[PDB]
Amino acid sequence: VMNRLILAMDLMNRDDALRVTGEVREYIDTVKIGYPLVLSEGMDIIAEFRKRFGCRIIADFKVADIPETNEKICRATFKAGADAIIVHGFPGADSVRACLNVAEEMGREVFLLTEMSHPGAEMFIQGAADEIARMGVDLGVKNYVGPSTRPERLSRLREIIGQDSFLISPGGDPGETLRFADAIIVGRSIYLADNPAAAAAGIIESIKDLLIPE
Amino acid sequence: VMNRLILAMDLMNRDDALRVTGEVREYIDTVKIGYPLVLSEGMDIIAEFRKRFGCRIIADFKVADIPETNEKICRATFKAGADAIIVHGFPGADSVRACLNVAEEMGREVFLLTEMSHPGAEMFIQGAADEIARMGVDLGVKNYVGPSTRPERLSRLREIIGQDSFLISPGGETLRFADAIIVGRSIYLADNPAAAAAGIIESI
Numbered sequence: 001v002m003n004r005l006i007l008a009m010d011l012m013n014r015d016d017a018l019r020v021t022g023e024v025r026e027y028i029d030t031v032k033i034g035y036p037l038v039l040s041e042g043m044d045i046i047a048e049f050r051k052r053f054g055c056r057i058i059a060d061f062k063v064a065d066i067p068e069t070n071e072k073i074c075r076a077t078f079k080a081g082a083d084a085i086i087v088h089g090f091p092g093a094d095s096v097r098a099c100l101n102v103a104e105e106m107g108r109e110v111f112l113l114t115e116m117s118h119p120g121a122e123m124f125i126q127g128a129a130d131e132i133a134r135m136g137v138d139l140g141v142k143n144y145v146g147p148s149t150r151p152e153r154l155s156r157l158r159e160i161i162g163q164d165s166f167l168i169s170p171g172g173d174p175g176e177t178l179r180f181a182d183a184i185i186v187g188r189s190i191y192l193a194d195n196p197a198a199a200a201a202g203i204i205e206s207i208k209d210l211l212i213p214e
Numbered sequence: 215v216m217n218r219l220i221l222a223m224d225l226m227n228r229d230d231a232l233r234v235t236g237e238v239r240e241y242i243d244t245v246k247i248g249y250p251l252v253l254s255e256g257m258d259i260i261a262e263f264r265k266r267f268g269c270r271i272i273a274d275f276k277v278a279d280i281p282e283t284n285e286k287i288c289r290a291t292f293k294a295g296a297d298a299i300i301v302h303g304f305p306g307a308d309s310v311r312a313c314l315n316v317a318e319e320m321g322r323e324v325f326l327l328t329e330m331s332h333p334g335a336e337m338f339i340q341g342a343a344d345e346i347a348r349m350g351v352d353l354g355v356k357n358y359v360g361p362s363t364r365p366e367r368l369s370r371l372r373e374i375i376g377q378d379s380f381l382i383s384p385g386g387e388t389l390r391f392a393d394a395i396i397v398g399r400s401i402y403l404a405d406n407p408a409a410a411a412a413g414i415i416e417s418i
């Protein structure tokens with residue numbers, strides 16, 4: 001949200017993760033954290049980022065279980081401090097709804113992952129992408145996460161979810177991506193930079209130059 | 215698996231989880247744990263189950279990310295002590311391959327989840343099940359997880375994966391096709407977990 005830039009904190013050692021995040025806090029307030037960091041350092045790391053830096057945390061857990069278990073995963077995740085959680089749609093409407101129910105009760109957010117673009121994604125994901133996105137619309141999902149690369153797929157997703165829905169995705173960027181996504185997710189280009197704060201600053205400048213309405 | 219019965223430990227607090235486990239260890243040696251428990255108590259609880267009870271641990275994490283991330287998830291999970299991890303097939307062969315390579319490197323195991331039967335699985339999962347199972351066969355997968363379903367349905371899954379493959383699924387008829395059955399609530403919510411487990415095993 002802040003500056004339409006989300007940091008994908010994918011480092012696995014706690015020191016570097018905390019260091020880099022604090023260094024860019026001036027320009028980025030939203031950070032995405034996945035399982036590798038959480039499983040190695042504990043869920044308390046989420047609480048630490050929020051408590052210590054006041055950032056918003058998106059748990060990229062790609063939740064993909066049956067309804068009752070999804071509910072428990074979301075509860076434990078929101079209890080630990082996450083503001084939002086990323087959920088798979090392939091498991092069906094029921095499994096997504098369970099996540100929406102907990103988010104509703106706790107005042108948090110669910111991001112629906114509609115497709116992936118890694119090799120192998122063409123086997124089952126690509127073919128179900130539009131239908132999964134439409135299922136999200138039918139479920140009242142308001143936040144979506146896009147695959148990656150291929151700007152043409154992004155345009156398609158936006159057409160399905162509408163102008164009102166919130167869409168985030170990784171990376172002529174940031175411009176190409178932000179023609180359709182509301183915020184761009186950036187990891188390496190920032191956390192592997194000699195001066196992370198400088199890299200974030202540079203990208204934010206590019207983003208502001210776009211003069212994006214609303 | 216001891217007595218062909220796997221305990222699905224879906225509780226979220228360490229005290230109840232450890233209590234039920236120690237009470238059924240004379241009957242069960244394999245325990246399946248999920249993110250609810252590990253996210254609530256820490257991945258270190260895996261070492262507690264193994265060092266304290268001698269349990270084999272199956273991490274039901276339904277791994278479903280890109281290859282590089284799946285690799286990291288499996289390495290952290292095996293490093294914490296899991297003997298095996300359950301992985302989704304819908305993200306494709308390469309995502310599954312990444313998990314299998316970490317298992318090969320660390321001497322552990324990967325279980326491919328072929329299907330689920332909850333009320334919504336009919337939308338995309340059911341239709342992909344046979345292809346996912348066949349995909350596992352071609353990737354050299356030897357361990358599979360089947361859905362909670364009528365035993366007749368597991369017959370088809372068994373025909374696909376062959377006689378040598380190892381199959382587990384939520385649960386006597388089921389054991390006509392699956393090598394072990396997975397049971398959770400009937401045992402861990404029981405006032406007497408030991409008696410519950412002993413009763414299930416007697417049904418053989």
Ligand SMILES: O=c1[nH]c(=O)c2[nH+]cn([C@@H]3O[C@H](COP(=O)(O)O)[C@@H](O)[C@H]3O)c2[nH]1
Pocket residue numbers: 008009010060116117118147148170171185186187188189280
């Ligand atoms: O579909 C995808 N296929 C990929 O190959 C891929 N690589 C990275 N990611 C996701 O993008 C976030 C940022 O990654 P970067 O460090 O490359 O900016 C990461 O945190 C991931 O969420 C991928 N998503």
Ligand SMILES: O=c1[nH]c(=O)c2[nH+]cn([C@@H]3O[C@H](COP(=O)(O)O)[C@@H](O)[C@H]3O)c2[nH]1
Pocket residue numbers: 066222223224274329330331332333360361362384396397398399400
């Ligand atoms: O395909 C499935 N459809 C379902 O509706 C379902 N409900 C539970 N489970 C799985 O079964 C394990 C044992 O659950 P119980 O506590 O009911 O014995 C659990 O740990 C789950 O892995 C399901 N699998």
